[PDB]
Amino acid sequence: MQPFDSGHDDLVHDVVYDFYGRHVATCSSDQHIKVFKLDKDTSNWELSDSWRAHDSSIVAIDWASPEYGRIIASASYDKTVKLWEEDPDQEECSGRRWNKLCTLNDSKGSLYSVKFAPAHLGLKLACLGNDGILRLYDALEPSDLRSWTLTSEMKVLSIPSDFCLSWCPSRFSPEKLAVSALEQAIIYQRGKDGKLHVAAKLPGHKSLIRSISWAPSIGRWYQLIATGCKDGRIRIFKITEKSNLQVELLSEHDDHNGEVWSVSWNLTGTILSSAGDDGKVRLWKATYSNEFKCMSVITA
Amino acid sequence: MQPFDSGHDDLVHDVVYDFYGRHVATCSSDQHIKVFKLDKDTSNWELSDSWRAHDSSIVAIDWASPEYGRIIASASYDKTVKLWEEDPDQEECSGRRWNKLCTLNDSKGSLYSVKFAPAHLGLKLACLGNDGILRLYDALEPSDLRSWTLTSEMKVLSIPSDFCLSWCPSRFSPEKLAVSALEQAIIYQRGKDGKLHVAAKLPGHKSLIRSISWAPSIGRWYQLIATGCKDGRIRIFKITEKSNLQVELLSEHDDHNGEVWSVSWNLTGTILSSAGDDGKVRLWKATYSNEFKCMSVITA
């Protein structure tokens, strides 16, 4: 496994795998979004297309279920999110390979993270800004991938900083989204009235929460969501749903001695990864007792 | 005087100065057009914008009188010409700084050279392809810089190769254009009937004619047009207009020992430049007798 030049002139922020894990979409402070392709023949990655996406620094990215087309979404410090439908009949390395399906100017403050809701709910997406306001967009009509409406607009809290969020993958559980603002982590669920509500919180954080992601509850009903905190501790919670949610603290690991920056899940929720200051990446597996044990560690 | 990276991945073809000689528009086989700006403060040139223009190799370029906007025109081996109106309210180095005002697909063969007619005739342009067919386009209406019509369509000769052309700058002389195809050089003039006609030819060429340009007849009535030939000889003709044209051969210089590739005029038709295989560029001035004498020589 050999690295490769992202090609970015300024520090890189997010890297997201498309559905089939064939491509990865980069994005950094150089205001450019880059999609790379994994060559079937040679095990090498090569730039599919780079192009100025936003005017300020870009920080988040996420693809949308191939059942809705090839739509990469992006958020930036320019206080606005942009969508991009890939143009199959184009060139590569050109810059005319992706178009602004639209632009979400509503956020009256710099955005930090945007993720597409699970496909079974439709073509929806959430995004959290610095104004501490959650915003849910969705092209009510899948045919015109250009007009997105404002579903919900909840406000988290004050702005005296780090953010991020992750929906609940499981297609067989009532819609819900977990958002984390600073030293907080709150779970939201859809109501009988079709409006969002605060279903529970993940207690225990002492510093800002660098990363949080929900896990694919494949084969199980109890949900699982991991936390990468600034204090240097990974946390795995077990949310069971009988107010009707129970939040359990399963594990907790300091193994990193620094700050947990990125915490990520397997595609079947079998493995969990944790990266931090100690420049190492630990992967975790679950026990029959459901406590988490690290299986391996990569370094630098 | 220090050079600078054109930035082109493949050999460069044409470089044209805009009206006020502030910018220069490059174009090479890497299918990219690049406009450079001359910094007032520091005597250095720096890239204004690069962008894939054509699909094949680009070979010619030419600006249009600022009185018609900022329109750069380009011809390529993709058998079609494209126009580009600069977007003042954009970025630089982006790629979204110039738009395809239109595209001239008519040429049923790879194009070689395209030059805008003088401003006093309107917003017109000529272009010569490999099919040996001259084509004159012009947005009959200056307001919509997107619809160009087909004025004239003359055919030069067979296709058993090099081409190029140059209009007659002078605002006080009846419209005319000099085109050169291979070992030929023909002058065309507008007729009483508004259709083109062959007014005269420049005799004397033994090989292909690399470059030909008409001179600014400022202060004089007799016209002057220079020839850069493959045989390695510059030729300066004196066309006086009383059929009504007289063609005189003024000078002839072998000083280059190779091939005259590029022959260019001053903005007042006071100096003439000749570049060729001998990697030197000679500049010529006229005598009181009107014979031409080289005044200086640059090299490598």
What number of residues does chain A have? Answer: 300
User: Going by DSSP bridges, is the β-strand pair B98-104/B81-86 parallel, antiparallel, or unpaired?
Assistant: antiparallel
Could you tell me which residues come within 8 angstroms of residue A206 by beta carbon, excluding any fewer than 6 positions away?
Answer: A183, A229, A231
DSSP per-residue codes, A70-123:
SEEEEEETTS-EEEEEE-TTS-SSSS-SEEEEEEETT-SS-EEEEEEPPGGG-S
Nearest CA in chain A to B92: A52
Best of B30, B33, B96, B97 to mutate (most A CBs within 10 Å, chain A)? B96
Minimum distance, in Å, between the CA of residue A91 and any CA atom of chain B = 10
- Resolution at which this structure was determined, Å: 3.8
d(C-alpha B37, C-alpha B47), whole Å: 6
What single-letter amino acid sits at B67?
E
From the number of C-beta atoms within 10 Å of its C-beta (0-12, 13-18, 19+), residue A38 rates as middle
H helix intervals, B178-292:
none
Q: Encoding tokens for residue A239?
A: 């949310």
Residue with tokens 């025109």: B73
By the 10 Å C-beta count (0-12 exposed, 13-18 middle, 19+ buried), A96 is classed as middle
Rounded to whole angstroms, the Cα distance separating B199 from B176 reads 9
**Among A56, A90, A96, A98, the residue to mutate for chain B (most B Cβ within 10 A):** A96
According to DSSP, residue A46 is labeled E
Domains of chain B (ranges, CATH numbers): 1-241+246-300 (2.130.10.10)
Q: What is the DSSP string of B228-293?
A: EETTS-EEEEEEEE---EEEEEEEEE-TTSS-EEEEEE-SSS--EEEEETTS-EEEEEE-TT--EE
Q: What share of chain A is helix, strand, coil (3-state, %, to 5)?
A: 0, 50, 50
Distances (CA, A) of B263 to A162, B242, B288: 63, 27, 22
| Cβ B225 vs Cβ B202: under 8 Å | yes
Round to whole Å and give the CA distance between A66 and B147.
40
> CB-based contacts of A31: which residues, under 8 Å, 6+ apart?
A10, A52, A53, A54, A55, A56, A57, A58, A76
Chain A residues closer than 8 Å to B51 by CB:
95
Tokens (6 digits) for B10: 């493949």
Give me the sign of the Cα torsion angle B98, B103, B108, B112: negative
Distance CA(B274)–CA(B287), nearest Å, equals 17
Q: Which distant-in-sequence residues (6+ apart) come within 8 Å of A90 by Cβ? A: A96, A97
Cα(B144)–Cα(A159) distance, integer angstroms? 51
Is the CB of residue B172 less than 8 Å from the CB of residue B194?
no
Only one residue has tokens 């370094």, namely: A299
